[PDB]
């Protein structure tokens, strides 16, 4: 499946099984653009989080209950959701994927 393939290729399952990961099917520039969209509170108390005006194409990858390194196994869920990112730096760009809504 896509999750197993992309998780491996992107070095999230080569040296562990990362329990959860989200992939966004939008251009890098359109995701970066989120950092000047709607400012929202972060879960951690900071306020450098931003929510996309638009829903975006995303794939959620979540480890199965039986999955165990090295034989990582994922469930793949596809959705169109608003994304929430934490932004930082100069340029002010996404550094953490927080949630999808």
């Amino acid at each position: 499946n896509y999750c197993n393939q992309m998780m491996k290729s992107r070095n999230l399952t080569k040296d562990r099984c990362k329990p959860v990961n989200t992939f966004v099917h939008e251009s890098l520039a359109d995701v970066q653009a989120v950092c000047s969209q709607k400012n929202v509170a972060c879960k951690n108390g900071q306020t450098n989080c931003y929510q996309s005006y638009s829903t975006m194409s995303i794939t959620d990858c979540r480890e199965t209950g039986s999955s165990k390194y090295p034989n990582c196994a994922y469930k793949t869920t596809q959705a169109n959701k608003h994304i929430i990112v934490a932004c930082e730096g100069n340029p002010y760009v996404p550094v953490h994927f927080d949630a999808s809504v």
Binding site: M6, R10, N11, L12, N21, T22, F23, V24, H25, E26, S27, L28, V31, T59, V85, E88, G89, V93, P94, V95, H96, F97
Partner: peptide
């Protein structure tokens, strides 16, 4: 050495 912005792109972007 990968930056935080680099790590986000690798982990999350699949344009």
């Amino acid at each position: 050495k990968e930056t935080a912005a680099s790590k986000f792109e690798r982990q999350h972007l699949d344009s």
